[PDB]
Short mmCIF file of C-alpha atoms in Angstrom, two decimals:
data_model
loop_
_atom_site.label_atom_id
_atom_site.label_comp_id
_atom_site.label_asym_id
_atom_site.label_seq_id
_atom_site.Cartn_x
_atom_site.Cartn_y
_atom_site.Cartn_z
CA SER A 1 13.19 34.59 -163.82
CA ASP A 2 15.04 34.93 -166.91
CA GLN A 3 17.88 34.37 -164.93
CA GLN A 4 16.17 30.90 -163.94
CA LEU A 5 15.64 30.13 -167.25
CA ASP A 6 18.79 31.50 -168.52
CA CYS A 7 21.06 28.87 -165.26
CA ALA A 8 17.97 26.11 -166.48
CA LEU A 9 19.59 26.19 -170.28
CA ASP A 10 22.85 26.35 -169.39
CA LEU A 11 22.28 23.09 -166.86
CA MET A 12 21.22 20.96 -169.87
CA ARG A 13 23.91 22.37 -171.76
CA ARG A 14 26.40 20.33 -169.20
CA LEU A 15 24.30 17.21 -167.41
CA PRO A 16 24.82 14.16 -169.46
CA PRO A 17 22.32 14.41 -172.44
CA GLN A 18 22.81 10.37 -171.53
CA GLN A 19 20.14 11.32 -169.59
CA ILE A 20 18.43 14.22 -171.09
CA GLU A 21 14.54 13.35 -170.07
CA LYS A 22 15.66 12.34 -166.58
CA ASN A 23 17.23 15.85 -166.34
CA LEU A 24 14.46 17.73 -167.83
CA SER A 25 12.29 16.75 -165.54
CA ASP A 26 14.31 16.49 -162.56
CA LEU A 27 14.31 20.36 -163.55
CA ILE A 28 10.84 20.89 -163.80
CA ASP A 29 10.77 18.95 -159.62
CA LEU A 30 13.48 21.74 -158.99
CA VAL A 31 11.72 24.75 -160.46
CA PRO A 32 8.52 23.81 -161.18
CA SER A 33 6.91 28.10 -161.86
CA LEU A 34 9.55 27.40 -164.77
CA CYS A 35 7.55 23.81 -166.54
CA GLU A 36 5.84 25.74 -169.00
CA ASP A 37 8.93 27.60 -170.21
CA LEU A 38 11.20 24.61 -169.96
CA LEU A 39 8.62 22.48 -171.98
CA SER A 40 8.85 25.21 -174.73
CA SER A 41 12.42 25.66 -175.16
CA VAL A 42 14.10 22.60 -173.86
CA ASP A 43 14.18 20.27 -176.54
CA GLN A 44 13.71 16.00 -175.94
CA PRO A 45 14.16 13.18 -177.76
CA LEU A 46 11.74 12.49 -180.42
CA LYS A 47 8.65 9.95 -179.61
CA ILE A 48 6.11 7.99 -181.77
CA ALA A 49 2.93 7.59 -181.75
CA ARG A 50 0.58 5.46 -183.85
CA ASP A 51 -2.77 7.55 -185.92
CA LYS A 52 -5.16 5.03 -185.72
CA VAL A 53 -7.32 6.23 -188.39
CA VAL A 54 -4.28 6.08 -191.26
CA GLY A 55 -2.33 3.80 -189.86
CA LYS A 56 1.03 6.19 -189.93
CA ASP A 57 2.90 7.16 -186.67
CA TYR A 58 3.52 10.76 -185.97
CA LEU A 59 5.92 12.47 -183.78
CA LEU A 60 5.34 13.64 -180.53
CA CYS A 61 6.91 16.79 -178.81
CA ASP A 62 5.93 19.52 -177.00
CA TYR A 63 4.30 22.19 -180.04
CA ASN A 64 1.95 18.92 -180.44
CA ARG A 65 1.13 18.88 -177.45
CA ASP A 66 -2.20 20.18 -175.60
CA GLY A 67 -3.03 19.45 -171.97
CA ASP A 68 -1.88 15.73 -172.07
CA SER A 69 -3.01 14.75 -175.85
CA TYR A 70 -1.02 15.21 -178.90
CA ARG A 71 -1.88 16.15 -182.39
CA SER A 72 -0.95 14.06 -185.57
CA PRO A 73 -1.27 15.77 -188.12
CA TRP A 74 -2.58 13.41 -190.65
CA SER A 75 -6.26 13.53 -189.14
CA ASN A 76 -5.73 16.64 -187.13
CA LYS A 77 -6.86 15.02 -183.93
CA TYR A 78 -5.55 14.88 -180.38
CA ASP A 79 -5.23 11.85 -178.85
CA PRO A 80 -6.25 11.51 -176.53
CA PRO A 81 -9.63 12.86 -177.45
CA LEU A 82 -9.68 17.02 -176.64
CA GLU A 83 -12.13 19.30 -176.10
CA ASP A 84 -11.02 22.46 -177.56
CA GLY A 85 -7.11 21.78 -178.01
CA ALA A 86 -5.08 24.65 -180.00
CA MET A 87 -5.68 24.27 -184.02
CA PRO A 88 -3.96 25.37 -186.88
CA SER A 89 -6.00 27.96 -188.78
CA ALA A 90 -8.03 26.51 -191.71
CA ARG A 91 -5.60 28.47 -194.10
CA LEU A 92 -2.85 27.54 -191.91
CA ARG A 93 -3.91 23.62 -191.57
CA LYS A 94 -4.04 23.35 -195.48
CA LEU A 95 -0.33 24.83 -195.53
CA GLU A 96 0.59 22.12 -192.85
CA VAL A 97 -0.99 19.27 -194.99
CA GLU A 98 1.18 20.32 -197.75
CA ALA A 99 4.42 20.75 -195.57
CA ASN A 100 3.91 16.82 -194.44
CA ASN A 101 3.70 15.62 -197.58
CA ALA A 102 6.57 17.70 -198.70
CA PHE A 103 8.97 16.75 -195.76
CA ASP A 104 7.76 13.25 -195.93
CA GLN A 105 9.57 12.49 -199.52
CA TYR A 106 12.38 15.29 -197.98
CA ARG A 107 12.76 11.94 -195.48
CA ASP A 108 12.10 9.30 -197.95
CA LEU A 109 15.63 10.93 -199.85
CA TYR A 110 17.82 11.87 -197.45
CA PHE A 111 16.74 9.11 -194.51
CA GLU A 112 15.96 6.70 -196.83
CA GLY A 113 13.29 5.55 -193.66
CA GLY A 114 12.21 6.78 -190.31
CA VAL A 115 9.04 8.82 -189.71
CA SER A 116 8.28 12.75 -190.30
CA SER A 117 5.67 15.22 -188.72
CA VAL A 118 5.02 19.22 -189.57
CA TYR A 119 3.22 21.26 -187.13
CA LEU A 120 2.66 24.38 -187.70
CA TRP A 121 0.49 27.18 -185.39
CA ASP A 122 -0.76 30.73 -186.36
CA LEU A 123 0.78 33.84 -185.28
CA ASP A 124 -0.17 37.84 -185.60
CA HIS A 125 1.63 38.86 -188.27
CA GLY A 126 2.57 35.41 -190.11
CA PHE A 127 3.07 32.18 -188.61
CA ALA A 128 5.49 29.39 -187.04
CA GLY A 129 6.30 25.28 -187.68
CA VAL A 130 8.22 22.68 -186.45
CA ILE A 131 9.35 20.44 -189.16
CA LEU A 132 10.62 16.63 -186.81
CA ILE A 133 12.52 13.85 -188.28
CA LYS A 134 13.12 11.07 -186.46
CA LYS A 135 15.14 7.69 -187.92
CA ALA A 136 16.99 4.96 -185.39
CA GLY A 137 18.94 2.28 -187.00
CA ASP A 138 17.52 -1.64 -185.75
CA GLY A 139 17.84 -1.43 -181.94
CA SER A 140 18.94 -5.86 -182.24
CA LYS A 141 22.60 -4.02 -183.69
CA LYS A 142 23.47 -3.59 -179.63
CA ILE A 143 25.16 -0.54 -181.75
CA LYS A 144 21.93 1.53 -181.19
CA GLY A 145 21.86 4.76 -183.48
CA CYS A 146 19.47 7.17 -183.47
CA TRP A 147 18.89 10.57 -184.85
CA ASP A 148 16.22 13.67 -183.91
CA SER A 149 15.75 17.01 -186.30
CA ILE A 150 13.88 19.54 -184.84
CA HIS A 151 13.57 22.59 -186.97
CA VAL A 152 11.44 25.57 -185.65
CA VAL A 153 11.12 28.12 -188.09
CA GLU A 154 9.09 31.50 -188.14
CA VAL A 155 7.72 33.30 -190.57
CA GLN A 156 7.17 36.64 -190.63
CA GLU A 157 4.57 37.92 -193.27
CA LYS A 158 4.84 41.29 -195.03
CA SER A 159 1.47 42.90 -195.95
CA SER A 160 2.62 42.34 -199.63
CA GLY A 161 2.72 38.68 -199.53
CA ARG A 162 5.29 39.04 -201.85
CA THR A 163 8.35 38.89 -199.37
CA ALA A 164 8.59 37.68 -195.67
CA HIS A 165 11.49 36.80 -193.10
CA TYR A 166 12.59 33.30 -192.25
CA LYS A 167 13.76 32.49 -189.04
CA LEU A 168 15.12 28.77 -188.34
CA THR A 169 16.20 27.47 -185.33
CA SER A 170 17.23 24.17 -186.00
CA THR A 171 18.37 21.11 -183.34
CA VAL A 172 19.84 17.53 -184.61
CA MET A 173 20.63 15.11 -181.60
CA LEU A 174 22.62 11.89 -182.22
CA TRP A 175 22.56 9.33 -180.69
CA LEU A 176 25.48 5.80 -180.97
CA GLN A 177 25.70 3.53 -178.49
CA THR A 178 27.75 0.52 -178.08
CA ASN A 179 29.03 -2.14 -175.87
CA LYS A 180 31.76 -4.56 -177.50
CA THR A 181 34.74 -6.69 -175.74
CA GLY A 182 37.58 -3.83 -176.70
CA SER A 183 35.79 -0.38 -176.25
CA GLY A 184 33.61 -1.60 -173.19
CA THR A 185 30.66 0.36 -173.25
CA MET A 186 30.68 4.06 -175.45
CA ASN A 187 27.65 6.22 -175.57
CA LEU A 188 28.62 9.42 -177.56
CA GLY A 189 25.28 11.37 -177.59
CA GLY A 190 23.52 14.40 -177.40
CA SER A 191 22.99 17.92 -179.64
CA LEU A 192 23.55 20.92 -181.91
CA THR A 193 21.87 23.65 -182.84
CA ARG A 194 22.28 26.28 -184.99
CA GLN A 195 19.99 29.32 -185.93
CA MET A 196 19.44 31.30 -189.38
CA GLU A 197 17.62 33.98 -190.76
CA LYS A 198 16.33 35.35 -194.27
CA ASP A 199 14.48 37.61 -196.13
CA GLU A 200 13.12 35.65 -199.17
CA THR A 201 10.56 36.23 -201.99
CA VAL A 202 7.16 34.41 -201.78
CA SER A 203 5.02 33.95 -204.93
CA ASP A 204 3.29 30.94 -207.48
CA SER A 205 6.83 29.78 -207.96
CA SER A 206 8.65 30.23 -204.77
CA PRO A 207 5.93 29.86 -202.16
CA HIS A 208 6.66 29.31 -198.05
CA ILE A 209 7.07 25.08 -198.34
CA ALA A 210 10.04 25.64 -201.06
CA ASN A 211 11.77 28.22 -198.85
CA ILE A 212 11.53 26.99 -195.66
CA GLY A 213 12.16 23.50 -197.44
CA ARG A 214 15.45 25.08 -198.91
CA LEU A 215 16.46 26.73 -195.33
CA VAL A 216 15.69 22.73 -193.99
CA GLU A 217 17.97 21.32 -196.33
CA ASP A 218 20.71 23.68 -195.86
CA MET A 219 20.31 24.12 -192.45
CA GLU A 220 20.91 20.04 -192.00
CA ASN A 221 23.39 19.45 -194.87
CA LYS A 222 25.34 21.44 -192.62
CA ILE A 223 24.54 20.24 -189.08
CA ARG A 224 25.14 16.96 -190.68
CA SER A 225 28.87 17.89 -191.48
CA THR A 226 29.42 19.19 -188.16
CA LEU A 227 27.96 16.32 -186.60
CA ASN A 228 30.21 14.53 -188.64
CA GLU A 229 33.48 16.44 -187.29
CA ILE A 230 32.35 17.02 -183.61
CA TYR A 231 31.38 13.35 -182.76
CA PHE A 232 34.13 11.27 -185.05
CA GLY A 233 36.83 13.83 -185.23
CA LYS A 234 36.44 16.19 -182.18
CA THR A 235 35.78 13.65 -179.22
CA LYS A 236 37.75 11.36 -180.86
CA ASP A 237 40.99 13.66 -180.52
CA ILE A 238 40.30 14.44 -177.09
CA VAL A 239 39.94 11.00 -176.10
CA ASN A 240 43.53 10.68 -178.12
CA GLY A 241 44.38 13.16 -175.97
CA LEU A 242 44.18 12.75 -172.70
CA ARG A 243 46.43 9.45 -172.39
CA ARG B 1 4.52 20.25 -154.90
CA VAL B 2 7.59 19.25 -154.25
CA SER B 3 9.38 19.30 -150.62
CA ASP B 4 12.15 21.05 -149.86
CA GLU B 5 14.26 18.15 -149.08
CA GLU B 6 13.65 16.22 -152.85
CA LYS B 7 14.51 20.22 -154.08
CA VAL B 8 17.84 19.58 -152.47
CA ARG B 9 18.37 16.62 -153.25
CA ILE B 10 17.55 16.95 -156.78
CA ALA B 11 20.28 19.73 -156.29
CA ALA B 12 23.04 17.83 -155.00
CA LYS B 13 22.54 15.16 -157.64
CA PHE B 14 22.69 17.55 -160.38
CA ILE B 15 26.22 19.28 -158.32
CA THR B 16 27.31 15.02 -158.46
CA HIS B 17 26.76 15.12 -162.47
CA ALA B 18 28.86 18.41 -163.16
CA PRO B 19 31.31 17.49 -166.57
CA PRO B 20 35.08 17.84 -165.71
CA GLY B 21 36.10 20.90 -165.28
CA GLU B 22 32.33 22.31 -165.23
CA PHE B 23 31.95 21.96 -161.18
CA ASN B 24 31.45 25.62 -160.66
CA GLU B 25 28.99 26.54 -163.72
CA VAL B 26 26.68 23.86 -162.59
CA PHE B 27 27.33 24.89 -158.86
CA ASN B 28 26.29 28.31 -159.69
CA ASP B 29 22.91 27.51 -162.10
CA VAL B 30 21.99 25.18 -159.35
CA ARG B 31 22.73 27.76 -156.66
CA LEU B 32 20.02 30.45 -158.52
CA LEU B 33 17.51 27.38 -159.62
CA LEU B 34 17.09 26.53 -155.39
CA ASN B 35 17.19 30.51 -154.87
CA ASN B 36 17.31 29.31 -151.11
CA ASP B 37 20.98 29.81 -149.98
CA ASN B 38 20.83 28.22 -146.64
CA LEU B 39 18.71 25.00 -147.79
CA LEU B 40 21.55 24.21 -150.32
CA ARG B 41 23.97 24.36 -147.92
CA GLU B 42 22.06 21.86 -145.38
CA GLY B 43 21.29 19.25 -147.71
CA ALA B 44 23.91 18.98 -150.54
CA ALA B 45 27.63 19.29 -148.25
CA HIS B 46 28.36 16.29 -148.75
CA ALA B 47 27.95 16.68 -153.20
CA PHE B 48 30.98 18.53 -153.20
CA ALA B 49 33.18 15.62 -151.33
CA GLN B 50 31.69 13.09 -153.63
CA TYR B 51 31.97 15.05 -156.34
CA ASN B 52 35.67 15.69 -155.41
CA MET B 53 36.35 11.20 -154.70
CA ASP B 54 34.24 10.23 -158.08
CA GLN B 55 36.43 13.00 -160.50
CA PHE B 56 39.82 11.78 -158.66
CA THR B 57 40.65 15.09 -158.18
CA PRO B 58 44.26 16.14 -158.07
CA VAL B 59 46.10 18.44 -155.40
CA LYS B 60 49.08 19.61 -154.93
CA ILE B 61 50.11 19.94 -151.11
CA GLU B 62 53.15 21.97 -150.77
CA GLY B 63 56.52 20.72 -149.69
CA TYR B 64 56.08 17.54 -151.68
CA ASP B 65 56.55 16.53 -155.05
CA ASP B 66 53.91 15.87 -157.60
CA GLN B 67 50.12 15.28 -156.74
CA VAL B 68 47.90 13.03 -154.64
CA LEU B 69 43.90 12.36 -155.68
CA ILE B 70 41.32 12.92 -153.90
CA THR B 71 39.29 9.41 -153.59
CA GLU B 72 37.43 7.35 -151.40
CA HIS B 73 40.56 4.95 -150.44
CA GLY B 74 41.96 8.28 -149.41
CA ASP B 75 39.17 9.66 -147.02
CA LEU B 76 40.12 9.23 -143.73
CA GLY B 77 36.93 10.75 -142.07
CA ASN B 78 36.15 14.87 -141.07
CA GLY B 79 37.74 16.63 -144.07
CA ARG B 80 41.05 14.76 -144.20
CA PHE B 81 43.19 12.35 -146.72
CA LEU B 82 45.89 10.39 -146.81
CA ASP B 83 48.65 10.76 -149.23
CA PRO B 84 50.11 7.46 -149.21
CA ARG B 85 53.40 7.80 -150.65
CA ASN B 86 54.35 10.67 -148.51
CA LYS B 87 52.66 8.79 -145.59
CA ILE B 88 51.03 11.95 -143.88
CA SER B 89 46.72 12.78 -144.21
CA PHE B 90 46.10 16.38 -145.34
CA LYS B 91 43.03 18.08 -144.63
CA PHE B 92 41.14 18.78 -147.90
CA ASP B 93 38.79 22.26 -148.78
CA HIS B 94 35.93 20.48 -150.98
CA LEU B 95 35.08 23.96 -152.41
CA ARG B 96 38.75 25.83 -153.09
CA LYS B 97 40.31 22.53 -153.91
CA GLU B 98 42.95 23.15 -151.58
CA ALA B 99 45.01 21.04 -149.17
CA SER B 100 46.70 22.51 -145.81
CA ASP B 101 47.83 21.47 -142.95
CA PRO B 102 49.75 17.76 -143.33
CA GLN B 103 50.35 15.65 -140.54
CA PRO B 104 52.03 12.51 -140.19
CA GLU B 105 49.87 9.38 -140.48
CA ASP B 106 50.11 5.61 -140.46
CA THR B 107 47.24 3.21 -141.82
CA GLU B 108 48.65 -0.23 -142.29
CA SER B 109 51.98 -1.84 -142.38
CA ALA B 110 51.30 -5.56 -143.74
CA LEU B 111 51.54 -3.83 -147.49
CA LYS B 112 54.30 -1.01 -146.97
CA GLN B 113 56.92 -2.42 -148.98
CA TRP B 114 54.98 -3.74 -152.29
CA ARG B 115 52.64 -0.88 -152.02
CA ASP B 116 55.60 1.35 -151.96
CA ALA B 117 57.45 -0.81 -154.95
CA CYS B 118 53.67 -0.66 -157.43
CA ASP B 119 53.75 3.60 -156.93
CA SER B 120 57.28 3.98 -157.73
CA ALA B 121 56.55 1.61 -161.14
CA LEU B 122 53.00 2.64 -161.67
CA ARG B 123 54.47 6.56 -161.12
CA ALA B 124 56.45 5.99 -163.87
CA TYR B 125 54.28 4.42 -166.25
CA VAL B 126 51.56 7.23 -165.58
CA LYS B 127 54.26 9.53 -166.56
CA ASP B 128 55.17 7.96 -169.71
CA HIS B 129 51.22 7.15 -171.12
CA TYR B 130 49.65 9.88 -170.18
CA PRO B 131 51.28 14.24 -170.66
CA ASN B 132 49.49 15.23 -167.26
CA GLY B 133 48.48 12.33 -165.80
CA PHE B 134 48.89 11.64 -161.40
CA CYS B 135 48.09 8.49 -159.68
CA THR B 136 48.05 7.15 -156.12
CA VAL B 137 48.21 3.65 -154.97
CA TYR B 138 47.03 2.04 -151.30
CA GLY B 139 47.52 -0.66 -149.50
CA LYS B 140 45.22 -2.00 -147.65
CA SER B 141 43.46 -5.17 -145.90
CA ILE B 142 39.80 -5.51 -147.26
CA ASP B 143 37.42 -8.72 -146.05
CA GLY B 144 41.39 -10.38 -144.38
CA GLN B 145 42.37 -9.82 -147.94
CA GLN B 146 46.22 -8.09 -148.46
CA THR B 147 45.18 -5.72 -151.36
CA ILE B 148 46.69 -3.34 -153.49
CA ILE B 149 44.37 -0.08 -155.33
CA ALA B 150 46.37 2.15 -157.92
CA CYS B 151 44.68 5.52 -159.11
CA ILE B 152 45.30 6.88 -162.45
CA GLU B 153 43.87 10.24 -163.45
CA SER B 154 44.40 12.69 -166.37
CA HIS B 155 42.45 15.88 -167.47
CA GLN B 156 42.73 18.25 -170.06
CA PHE B 157 40.57 21.14 -169.52
CA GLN B 158 39.67 23.65 -172.35
CA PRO B 159 36.26 25.72 -171.38
CA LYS B 160 37.31 28.78 -173.45
CA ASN B 161 37.11 25.96 -176.99
CA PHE B 162 34.26 25.00 -175.33
CA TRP B 163 35.48 21.11 -174.50
CA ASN B 164 36.63 18.75 -171.33
CA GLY B 165 37.77 15.42 -170.39
CA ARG B 166 38.99 13.18 -167.72
CA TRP B 167 40.25 9.46 -168.03
CA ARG B 168 39.95 7.59 -164.45
CA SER B 169 41.56 4.11 -164.04
CA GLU B 170 40.83 1.89 -160.76
CA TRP B 171 43.16 -1.19 -160.41
CA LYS B 172 42.19 -3.15 -157.43
CA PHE B 173 45.23 -6.49 -156.87
CA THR B 174 44.03 -8.93 -154.03
CA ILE B 175 46.85 -10.13 -153.49
CA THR B 176 47.08 -13.66 -152.25
CA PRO B 177 50.28 -15.48 -153.44
CA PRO B 178 51.32 -16.68 -155.40
CA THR B 179 47.99 -15.67 -157.29
CA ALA B 180 46.81 -11.90 -157.25
CA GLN B 181 43.10 -11.42 -158.70
CA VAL B 182 43.32 -8.12 -160.19
CA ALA B 183 39.80 -5.89 -161.06
CA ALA B 184 40.30 -2.46 -162.62
CA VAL B 185 37.37 -0.32 -164.61
CA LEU B 186 38.88 2.57 -166.87
CA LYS B 187 36.09 5.31 -167.91
CA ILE B 188 36.71 8.47 -170.46
CA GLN B 189 34.23 11.68 -170.21
CA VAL B 190 34.57 14.06 -172.75
CA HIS B 191 32.09 16.94 -173.00
CA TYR B 192 32.40 19.43 -176.05
CA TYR B 193 29.56 22.34 -175.26
CA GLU B 194 30.06 25.29 -178.58
CA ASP B 195 26.36 25.42 -179.34
CA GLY B 196 25.16 21.78 -178.12
CA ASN B 197 26.07 19.56 -175.67
CA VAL B 198 27.58 16.68 -176.93
CA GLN B 199 29.29 13.95 -174.36
CA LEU B 200 31.01 10.51 -174.96
CA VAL B 201 30.85 8.40 -171.66
CA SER B 202 32.81 5.37 -171.64
CA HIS B 203 34.02 2.77 -169.44
CA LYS B 204 35.20 -0.88 -169.42
CA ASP B 205 35.50 -3.38 -166.37
CA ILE B 206 38.75 -5.70 -166.84
CA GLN B 207 39.36 -8.63 -164.78
CA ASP B 208 42.54 -11.26 -164.71
CA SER B 209 45.07 -12.96 -162.83
CA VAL B 210 48.43 -12.85 -162.36
CA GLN B 211 51.37 -15.42 -160.52
CA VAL B 212 53.07 -13.34 -158.09
CA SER B 213 56.67 -13.70 -156.40
CA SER B 214 58.48 -10.54 -154.66
CA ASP B 215 57.20 -7.18 -154.56
CA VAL B 216 59.80 -5.27 -157.27
CA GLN B 217 59.10 -8.44 -159.41
CA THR B 218 55.41 -8.53 -159.40
CA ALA B 219 54.95 -4.70 -159.18
CA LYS B 220 56.38 -4.98 -162.91
CA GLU B 221 53.77 -7.54 -163.65
CA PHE B 222 51.40 -5.50 -162.69
CA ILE B 223 52.43 -2.50 -164.95
CA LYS B 224 52.54 -5.23 -167.39
CA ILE B 225 49.08 -6.05 -167.22
CA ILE B 226 48.02 -2.18 -166.38
CA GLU B 227 49.63 -1.03 -169.73
CA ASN B 228 48.48 -3.95 -172.74
CA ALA B 229 44.32 -3.30 -170.87
CA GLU B 230 44.64 0.45 -171.11
CA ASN B 231 46.40 0.83 -174.74
CA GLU B 232 44.22 -2.23 -176.17
CA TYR B 233 41.07 -0.17 -174.51
CA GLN B 234 42.03 3.07 -176.22
CA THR B 235 42.79 0.73 -179.14
CA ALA B 236 39.25 -0.56 -179.68
CA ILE B 237 37.76 3.41 -178.55
CA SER B 238 39.47 4.45 -182.16
CA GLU B 239 38.43 2.10 -184.11
CA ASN B 240 34.99 1.97 -182.79
CA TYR B 241 34.67 5.42 -183.55
CA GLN B 242 34.98 4.79 -186.75
CA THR B 243 32.71 1.34 -187.14
CA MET B 244 30.06 4.56 -185.79
CA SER B 245 31.39 6.61 -188.49
CA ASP B 246 31.19 4.38 -191.72
CA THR B 247 27.87 2.08 -190.61
CA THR B 248 25.93 3.64 -188.28
CA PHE B 249 26.27 7.16 -189.11
CA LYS B 250 25.88 7.07 -192.43
CA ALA B 251 22.83 5.05 -192.16
CA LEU B 252 21.39 7.08 -190.07
CA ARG B 253 21.23 10.21 -193.22
CA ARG B 254 23.00 10.28 -196.45
CA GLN B 255 24.81 13.41 -196.99
CA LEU B 256 22.74 13.58 -200.91
CA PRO B 257 19.91 12.19 -202.36
CA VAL B 258 20.72 9.69 -204.77
CA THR B 259 20.85 11.72 -207.28
CA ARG B 260 23.52 13.40 -206.03
CA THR B 261 22.44 17.20 -206.15
CA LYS B 262 20.57 18.57 -203.26
CA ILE B 263 16.29 18.51 -203.72
CA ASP B 264 14.36 20.03 -206.43
CA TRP B 265 11.46 21.80 -204.45
CA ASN B 266 9.27 22.52 -207.67
CA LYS B 267 9.29 18.45 -208.47
CA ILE B 268 8.74 18.33 -204.32
CA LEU B 269 5.44 20.23 -204.79
CA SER B 270 4.39 18.42 -208.08
CA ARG C 1 28.39 32.97 -171.21
CA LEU C 2 26.96 30.38 -173.25
CA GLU C 3 23.97 31.42 -175.80
CA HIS C 4 20.68 29.99 -175.71
CA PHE C 5 19.33 29.70 -179.55
CA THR C 6 16.19 28.18 -178.65
CA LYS C 7 14.74 30.92 -176.07
CA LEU C 8 13.98 32.88 -178.89
CA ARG C 9 12.02 30.06 -180.68
CA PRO C 10 8.23 31.33 -181.08
CA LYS C 11 6.04 30.28 -178.52
CA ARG C 12 3.36 28.41 -179.07
CA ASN C 13 0.59 28.76 -177.32
CA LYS C 14 -1.40 25.85 -175.36
CA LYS C 15 -5.17 25.61 -174.75
CA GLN C 16 -4.25 23.60 -170.99
CA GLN C 17 -1.05 23.12 -169.57
CA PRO C 18 0.05 19.42 -168.94
CA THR C 19 -2.18 17.70 -165.34
#
């Protein structure tokens, strides 16, 4: 069923992204045996939930889900409450708290608003994490805009702890909708995904969060520029090539 | 879990939602996913025909100039379609996208002259305004009202560059001399899929009225209304691209922090 | 034909699948 997963992911690259959530739900109904693999590999728009303990929003996706509950990066608890859901190790949780604080500052500097969340998980010889950012324009503008960043980092640690190998797979979803007299309904939406890997020294002057921060920042800046080119350049030139 | 009849409904839905120029890829994906070739043939037969009629698929009939569009307006039943310009029906193979077996056909003649005048005017309009556009004009009585239905298609398929696009417009002129009521919808779909999936889906509805006289002078007024509205829509789309880019998009994320340099990650962690 | 980068993202193991 590598073949089936490849076909399902190809379909998600082709079906209109305006229906990205219904596309995934329909796919899971079509091939229920793929459910777990699809929830892992098919990115979805980020949803917001309230951590009632801290009065702060956090982001939901498959990477903080267990059963039908989601874990807050602020409280480290599942909602609704769960017995024995997947949890980062004690030491990884400390890194996760530190990463959440670093990425909230990153989010403020670049997005001047929105919501961020970071979720880490242990691997056999390292760890992995997702850094999530959601920013929506005012939905009262009938000129709707939303940005989702999904950055998944795998960190393979080496015995010394003086170097690590980082693999970053980043998706940005960008959604724009307008309903105007001249241009009628225009919905321009979807996502781009890119991947890169690097070895970096790990030290007190360059700890994991700094190494990950730089990779994320470099990738997101690059993707922002590519979105600009594709959305407002390429798709526009194509429209004008049709008539 | 999920019934076979539901699975093939979903399969049929996906097949009909293939972006322009990517029907075969979606179809092959859906086939492997359903993994039940005999189920797919039964429950998703309609899907191929539905896709072709929805997308205004242009087809060449050997021996006749230009191309005809496959549309709901031309569906004669039993796999045959009308070519109202050449006054023939033909068999259309929805899998191979091929026309065969042309046969004389006439449908209604209250509007023969008006349909021909409109067809002639629209053909020139489409060739002038679209790089490789096609049109088909139908004349039919709908609820006792004589109606000219003009369909226009233009696509550009560049899958090796990971993009495809299609324009469709459908214009209805309900002729009640000396007035014609105008109703139209203009539609655009563009897909870009190099390392992603980005789509523009756009449509605009048009309503208008025009005072009518003779067939030829009226056809002329119809094409003037079409031209103004389609030019207006294209202009507005490009203006909206500009507004989206320097308002909404810029507001979602800065290029850089106010410092005009990348982040000092050491200040961050302190 | 298309490359699917998300296939190679590290799996996170859950305790419970969705219900």
